[PDB]
Design an enzyme around this catalytic site. Structure first.
Site, mmCIF file in Angstrom:
data_model
loop_
_atom_site.group_PDB
_atom_site.id
_atom_site.type_symbol
_atom_site.label_atom_id
_atom_site.label_comp_id
_atom_site.label_asym_id
_atom_site.label_seq_id
_atom_site.Cartn_x
_atom_site.Cartn_y
_atom_site.Cartn_z
ATOM 1 N N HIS A 117 -45.867 -21.104 -65.167
ATOM 2 C CA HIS A 117 -46.553 -22.304 -65.701
ATOM 3 C C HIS A 117 -45.902 -23.507 -65.113
ATOM 4 C CE1 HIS A 117 -47.454 -19.866 -69.532
ATOM 5 N NE2 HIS A 117 -48.179 -19.279 -68.761
HETATM 6 C C1 LIG Z 1 -49.127 -13.877 -63.079
HETATM 7 C C2 LIG Z 1 -49.328 -15.396 -63.850
HETATM 8 C C3 LIG Z 1 -49.667 -15.149 -65.133
HETATM 9 C C4 LIG Z 1 -50.035 -16.300 -65.851
HETATM 10 N N1 LIG Z 1 -50.827 -16.175 -66.992
HETATM 11 C C5 LIG Z 1 -51.497 -17.201 -67.857
HETATM 12 C C6 LIG Z 1 -52.246 -17.064 -68.878
HETATM 13 O O1 LIG Z 1 -52.143 -15.870 -69.269
HETATM 14 N N2 LIG Z 1 -52.888 -18.120 -69.358
HETATM 15 C C7 LIG Z 1 -52.794 -19.467 -68.731
HETATM 16 O O2 LIG Z 1 -53.560 -20.507 -69.086
HETATM 17 N N3 LIG Z 1 -52.201 -19.576 -67.507
HETATM 18 C C8 LIG Z 1 -51.456 -18.543 -66.681
HETATM 19 N N4 LIG Z 1 -50.656 -18.809 -65.807
HETATM 20 C C9 LIG Z 1 -50.527 -20.123 -65.308
HETATM 21 C C10 LIG Z 1 -51.752 -20.625 -64.609
HETATM 22 O O3 LIG Z 1 -52.673 -19.527 -63.977
HETATM 23 C C11 LIG Z 1 -51.015 -21.386 -63.206
HETATM 24 O O4 LIG Z 1 -50.547 -22.616 -64.002
HETATM 25 C C12 LIG Z 1 -52.384 -22.026 -62.540
HETATM 26 O O5 LIG Z 1 -53.056 -20.979 -61.819
HETATM 27 C C13 LIG Z 1 -51.957 -22.993 -61.638
HETATM 28 O O6 LIG Z 1 -52.779 -23.901 -60.995
HETATM 29 P P1 LIG Z 1 -52.656 -24.928 -59.756
HETATM 30 O O7 LIG Z 1 -54.132 -25.285 -59.314
HETATM 31 O O8 LIG Z 1 -52.002 -25.934 -60.077
HETATM 32 O O9 LIG Z 1 -52.099 -24.203 -58.671
HETATM 33 P P2 LIG Z 1 -52.299 -22.505 -58.223
HETATM 34 O O10 LIG Z 1 -53.236 -21.616 -59.137
HETATM 35 O O11 LIG Z 1 -51.029 -21.866 -58.034
HETATM 36 O O12 LIG Z 1 -53.384 -22.231 -56.660
HETATM 37 C C14 LIG Z 1 -52.839 -22.740 -55.513
HETATM 38 C C15 LIG Z 1 -53.385 -22.250 -54.345
HETATM 39 O O13 LIG Z 1 -53.156 -22.588 -52.918
HETATM 40 C C16 LIG Z 1 -52.751 -21.453 -52.159
HETATM 41 N N5 LIG Z 1 -52.082 -21.995 -51.250
HETATM 42 C C17 LIG Z 1 -50.628 -22.078 -51.470
HETATM 43 N N6 LIG Z 1 -49.937 -22.807 -50.451
HETATM 44 C C18 LIG Z 1 -50.870 -22.965 -49.473
HETATM 45 C C19 LIG Z 1 -50.903 -23.575 -48.260
HETATM 46 N N7 LIG Z 1 -49.861 -24.139 -47.817
HETATM 47 N N8 LIG Z 1 -52.197 -23.638 -47.581
HETATM 48 C C20 LIG Z 1 -53.487 -23.173 -48.173
HETATM 49 N N9 LIG Z 1 -53.280 -22.563 -49.355
HETATM 50 C C21 LIG Z 1 -52.148 -22.561 -50.060
HETATM 51 C C22 LIG Z 1 -52.530 -20.281 -53.222
HETATM 52 O O14 LIG Z 1 -52.961 -19.037 -52.398
HETATM 53 C C23 LIG Z 1 -53.054 -20.729 -54.304
HETATM 54 O O15 LIG Z 1 -54.530 -20.199 -54.151
HETATM 55 C C24 LIG Z 1 -50.207 -17.751 -65.124
HETATM 56 C C25 LIG Z 1 -50.032 -17.768 -63.702
HETATM 57 C C26 LIG Z 1 -49.647 -16.348 -62.960
HETATM 58 C C27 LIG Z 1 -49.324 -16.541 -61.619
#
Ligand SMILES: Cc1cc2nc3c(=O)[nH]c(=O)nc-3n(C[C@H](O)[C@H](O)[C@H](O)COP(=O)(O)OP(=O)(O)OC[C@H]3O[C@@H](n4cnc5c(N)ncnc54)[C@H](O)[C@@H]3O)c2cc1C
Ligand SMILES: Cc1cc2nc3c(=O)[nH]c(=O)nc-3n(C[C@H](O)[C@H](O)[C@H](O)COP(=O)(O)OP(=O)(O)OC[C@H]3O[C@@H](n4cnc5c(N)ncnc54)[C@H](O)[C@@H]3O)c2cc1C
Lengths: 649, 647, 93, 93
Positions: free
Chosen positions: A559
């Site tokens: 998270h």
């Molecule tokens: C295993 C796991 C379990 C969890 N379970 C839950 C749950 O049950 N319920 C819930 O609500 N939330 C859950 N979460 C939390 C939630 O999924 C995350 O907080 C959320 O996905 C984050 O969203 P975001 O857009 O901020 O970043 P992210 O989802 O982290 O997306 C970032 C993206 O950018 C890409 N990336 C990174 N660096 C670069 C770069 N330099 N260039 C290009 N691409 C890049 C990555 O591949 C990724 O696709 C969990 C997360 C994980 C990983």
């Protein structure tokens, strides 16, 4: 494939996906490109089948849907260990691989962002906008023509109501919806990011991006493409972006950049871990750090990568009876069990056991005044200045997994449930900084877990409470001594492991079941429905053994947030109230990096919302109207806009 | 929430109709349904019909039933303490029952002698509730209601075999034995199962879940056992207090939560549940309430009394091995369970598992010649209850295409059982709490066979259904172990498995065909062209049957009458609108209110009391009930006209 | 009777197959005590029928304990008749 | 190795092993499998190092509590009631 587009979204996580799809849909004229570090996720059966989410965290030299960040330095607060923090490395990011628990942040969480346009009241419509809510509730705080499907899955597991009866028995109230923005203290059947009709994982890529690419031609998708840096103007205007191969597998590892230009806007949606690294190596971050690395300064924002915040997870494992339905054997790789569930899901996904995360109940909880006293000086102080006047904020989260979430290589035979626990608003704080301008090299990292003494008591307290739940459950057949705190063996708190009867069932032909030699576990007396039950008393030494168990076994909850914080610059902030990176033009962070403080929720909901909010901010800067509903989502039924039942097959 | 308008205590069929109808009637009316058992929504150990049998297991695992045992051994049952289970799960019986579709007769409702409850009064409501999915040659069925009724996915060969033997013994065939007019005939037996989805028609999904999906105003609280109704100064029901289902709090303390009710309190906790709630609420027998220390609100000694039921007997017959039966499934043979679970998933519209496997039966009634040999005390009952009530059957009888019995006490091979129940028994029992605490076992007495009239009809049914068994094509014999203790040399004595059937069970067996022990008289190997005669029975053969009834008569889970709707001075408890006497804003609407019995499996009866109960409250609150009800989950979109099966 | 007293004292004893024993009156303290629920559940652990009371076909034994203090079965003149009948019905070469 | 075994075992060594050179302090062997309850072991394969102290200083007793020959006797292993026994077992680990 174009060398120039209007908008570039860097990182295809939930937020990046919301942005990329909403804007490209807002205006068919606007060329937008989504650049994603990891692989495309489209119609991958190891994505859309929810019940295999567990494997996504295997550190086994095959799985590549994750990056694992290790603490550079060992931590004295985790008793010498180097915390490990993974995150997604796949299109859809977290949403492609996560545990799929639908949770929502309390109202104050947003208000407490101390920013206009980000009040609960400001965002509530946007909360509804993204939701395809497909389950009952006794409120109107959910949405019903959104892209992202939310339901109770195909099949709730019996241990979930088992958990609910136990929860009631210790005084946490039942509720229809703990995700009503209002609840800090209550127990619900936990919903999932799964479509109850299709049985498919509600990942953010199919919802927002694949939808649009199937009907329009202005949304470009570049996968397997790590975004190294943002290209700037003579006046810090983001003018384009460079990207490389995910694999540094060129001839003699010579760096291979490809520049694609942005006429109008650059968004960074690469996550709490990814986004700060693009800034720093682009020339935006701590000035002295950029100086040591040879990166020309563009904006000196020392708060870049600081204030790493998370939820801190503890996993208390309990042995259960062998006539219990758990996931353990499926998790062990038992061919005919896997064969059964895979078949059941392909044939009838509307009701399949694989159309679930098997985390089918839990609670948000809050301590009594009674219970505060048992906590310490430092936390009561945090309570007073943070939780006291904020009654919708829960201290700890607790849920039941209908299986052992841990290495089965390190678990005995039999079946388990685990009490999954996380601390909702920790005081402790970490950081992340590039070690190089080259984007293949690991950055410095410090998860930060437990570098504030205040974070210990609430977790310690969760342990006691989640245990009192377990002992009160019908499925209960003892603690798992191996994976519990190191109690004195003659403490009334010491673990009671498997009973002889549950033991004889596991191996009825074994020569070994019930051999005392070793005194490795104190067996439980066999299960009685009629057992009068009293609480475990803990001495001071017991609480230390637990504190030590937290230090040793406390873990991330994925998270991750706060590395590009939305507050005034002079308070160490990185973004505007429209998510503009200070010192720049045409550059925004939208993902959980921008969070100024924590949220009491599984943060998929939050990143989707931060996403939707960015879509607005950008669209009203470009004279662009967002459409509702979004492009219809692949494989999903035509929704109705209002609450309705499970349809015909 | 802490305060709603209508609280419905107990989510059986009755409680589901009330709660559902009322919340859908006015969406500003807040109604909470408190149900002591677990939520049943989308549970495959509920919605799949062909696993129902597991629900009666006392294996210490199954938690879907609460079992009442007689406090005292009955002389009339030769010293045995009777067991009477009921459902402990959302949807009540309808979530675990045998799913047999059956309706009471017209004279049954008329004979409540109560205004608004005539048959002609309730015909509209009987139809309001049904979604009839099978042919018939009459217009007594409803086609736009929430509860699906069908012949299931696949009917068992033995049902038609039964129907033939039934013909041989002078019982005529019918399109529909549930047409309110039929006391004596044989049918293909329908089920509370949806033809198209292959799903069990539980009342919770039909009437509650449906509404919870489209509205915010219906609240459900499961795993909550209602302790007591709270009363005013002036005996106005004001609220309810419920406890955890498991008494598992710190040191077994009593953690009550209270929910107030601005407008109504409905007790729908079933025949065994409601009297106890009344009793600990201070409504019941003054002396009992005094001894237990309960404030008397209304002195109603009728509460707990006049327990009525149907009295089951279970005649088990060994059949051929090429016969299609449920036995191996019930044994837990792996590839048999795998096959039927699979099949049901892939095509539930034809799956064996889209059935209860109870696929034919009769309602029957004795001729004058039959009457003569049933002795004085029934004959008395007959002249006073049956003689000029010609639409009332004496005995139900049906074939289960498998042994409804503990297979741990059954030889190998396949069976069928003639499931029989006495329609209108004279015997009576009662139920009373023994503490204020809602966890202490109550005093109980089935009362089965405590009136001697009830023996002759059940004796008659044993003999009669044996003639139907004997004349089937599947008949390979009678299971001595499970039959009456006739004298070995009596023509009446059982002829068990033949040497040929046996040899197929164990083709490499070493003991198949050893006489040593003389534990059975082998049947002769089956012949198509064998002439078959009635078994003659003597006075001592007759005594053996009465012994077997006394030893093996059981509940039929059709429990009712513990809060009789009749005048207070007759031993009543509720008025003509189901108000509890000496109270305001409190109604019993479930089977407790029945002042006499009904010639039917009582799910149909339970739902109908539900519907009439909804109407009564609805007219009192100035509400109009909506037709049709909110769409039932997973179900096809229903037309409201008789129709065939869709693609 | 003698061999029955032997049976009841065996470590293996889990009950009396009621179907193949004398026709004792059910209330008779001599009445057969058949298989226990725990022994049954091992036989068909996946079975839906084990531990269904309905029918009252057998009085289940109570689960086994090495401690059980064992008193000899009291037989009435009635019980003796049922064994006699059982002997004439089931005696052989 | 003596030097690190502490004062109370050293005194015993001086009195019981010093000049009794055919007497071993500890026994150790390889069980080609886990000699423990597998119900409390992860999956995979194990070996165990079976070790016992050859000449303990610690002393127990057994005493009856009754003439009746079926009643449990009083008992105390006496295991480790003499601190001398800890050092050599630690050394074995
Ligand atoms: C295993 C796991 C379990 C969890 N379970 C839950 C749950 O049950 N319920 C819930 O609500 N939330 C859950 N979460 C939390 C939630 O999924 C995350 O907080 C959320 O996905 C984050 O969203 P975001 O857009 O901020 O970043 P992210 O989802 O982290 O997306 C970032 C993206 O950018 C890409 N990336 C990174 N660096 C670069 C770069 N330099 N260039 C290009 N691409 C890049 C990555 O591949 C990724 O696709 C969990 C997360 C994980 C990983
Ligand atoms: C095993 C079985 C087989 C049967 N087979 C058939 C059949 O094949 N066909 C047929 O038509 N009928 C059948 N019946 C009979 C039929 O199901 C019942 O007559 C019918 O369910 C009665 O409905 P009811 O509302 O009167 O009470 P019930 O259906 O018994 O439901 C009462 C509810 O009250 C709840 N409850 C009880 N006490 C409390 C309390 N203190 N607090 C809170 N909640 C409480 C229980 O959990 C239950 O859900 C069967 C029933 C059972 C149990």
């Amino acid at each position: 494939h174009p060398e120039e587009v209007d908008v570039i979204v860097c990182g295809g996580g939930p937020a990046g996906c919301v942005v990329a799809g909403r804007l490209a849909y807002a205006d068919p004229t606007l060329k937008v490109m989504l650049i994603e570090g990891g692989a495309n996720n489209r119609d991958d059966p190891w994505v859309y089948r929810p019940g295999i989410y567990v494997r996504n965290m295997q550190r086994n030299g095959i799985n590549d849907k994750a990056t694992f960040y290790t603490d550079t330095m060992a931590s004295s607060y985790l008793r010498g260990r180097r915390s490990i923090v993974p995150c997604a490395n796949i299109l859809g990011g977290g949403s492609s691989i996560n545990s799929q628990m639908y949770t929502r942040a309390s109202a104050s969480d947003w208000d407490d962002f101390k920013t206009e346009g980000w009040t609960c009241k400001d965002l509530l419509p946007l909360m509804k906008r993204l939701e395809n809510y497909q389950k009952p509730c006794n409120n109107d705080t959910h949405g019903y023509d959104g892209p992202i499907a939310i339901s109770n899955g195909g099949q709730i597991m019996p241990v979930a109501q088992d958990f609910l009866r136990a929860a009631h028995a210790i005084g946490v109230p039942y509720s229809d919806d703990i995700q009503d923005l209002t609840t800090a203290h209550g127990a619900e059947i936990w919903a999932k990011y799964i479509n109850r009709h299709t049985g498919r994982r509600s990942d953010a890529a199919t919802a927002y991006v694949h939808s649009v690419m199937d009907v329009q031609d202005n949304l470009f998708l570049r996968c397997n493409a790590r975004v190294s840096r943002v290209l700037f103007d003579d006046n810090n205007k983001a003018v384009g972006v460079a990207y490389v191969p995910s694999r540094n597998r060129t001839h003699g590892g010579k760096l291979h950049e490809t520049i694609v230009k942005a006429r109008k806007m650059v968004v960074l949606s690469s996550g709490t871990l990814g986004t700060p690294q693009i800034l720093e190596r682009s020339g935006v971050g701590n000035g002295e750090l950029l100086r040591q690395l040879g990166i020309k300064i563009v904006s000196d924002l020392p708060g870049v990568g600081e204030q790493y915040q998370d939820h801190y997870t503890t996993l208390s494992i309990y042995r259960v009876s062998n006539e219990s339905i758990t996931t353990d054997d499926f998790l062990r790789g038992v061919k005919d069990v896997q064969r059964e569930l895979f078949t059941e899901w392909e044939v009838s996904p509307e009701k399949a056991r694989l159309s679930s995360n098997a985390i089918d109940a839990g609670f948000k909880i809050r301590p009594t005044e009674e219970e505060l006293k048992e906590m310490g000086p430092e936390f009561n102080e945090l309570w007073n200045r943070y939780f006291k006047d904020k009654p919708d904020k829960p201290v700890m989260f607790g849920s039941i997994v209908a299986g052992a979430y841990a290495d089965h290589t390190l678990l005995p035979p039999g079946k388990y449930i685990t009490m999954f626990q996380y601390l909702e608003y920790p005081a402790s704080r970490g950081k992340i900084h590039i070690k190089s301008q080259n984007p293949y090299v690991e950055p410095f990292f410090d998860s930060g877990f437990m570098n504030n003494k205040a974070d210990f008591a609430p977790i310690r307290w969760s342990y006691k409470k989640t245990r009192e739940v377990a002992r009160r459950m019908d499925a209960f057949r003892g603690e798992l001594t191996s994976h519990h705190p190191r109690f004195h063996p003659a403490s009334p708190a010491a673990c009671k492991d498997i009973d002889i009867e549950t033991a004889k069932q596991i191996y009825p032909d074994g020569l070994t079941v019930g051999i005392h030699m070793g005194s490795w576990h104190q067996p439980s007396e066999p299960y009685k429905h009629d057992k009068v039950i009293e609480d475990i008393p803990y001495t001071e030494e017991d609480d230390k053994a637990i504190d030590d168990w937290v230090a040793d076994h406390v873990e991330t909850t994925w998270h991750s947030l706060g590395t590009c914080a939305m507050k005034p610059r002079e308070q160490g902030g990185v973004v505007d109230k429209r998510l503009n990176v200070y010192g720049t033009q045409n550059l925004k962070c939208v993902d959980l990096s921008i969070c100024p403080d924590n949220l009491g929720t599984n943060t998929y909901s939050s990143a989707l919302l931060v996403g939707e909010k960015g879509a607005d901010l950008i669209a009203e800067e470009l004279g662009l109207k967002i459409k509702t509903p979004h492009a219809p989502v692949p494989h999903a039924p035509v929704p109705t806009g209002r609450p309705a039942t499970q349809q015909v097959r």
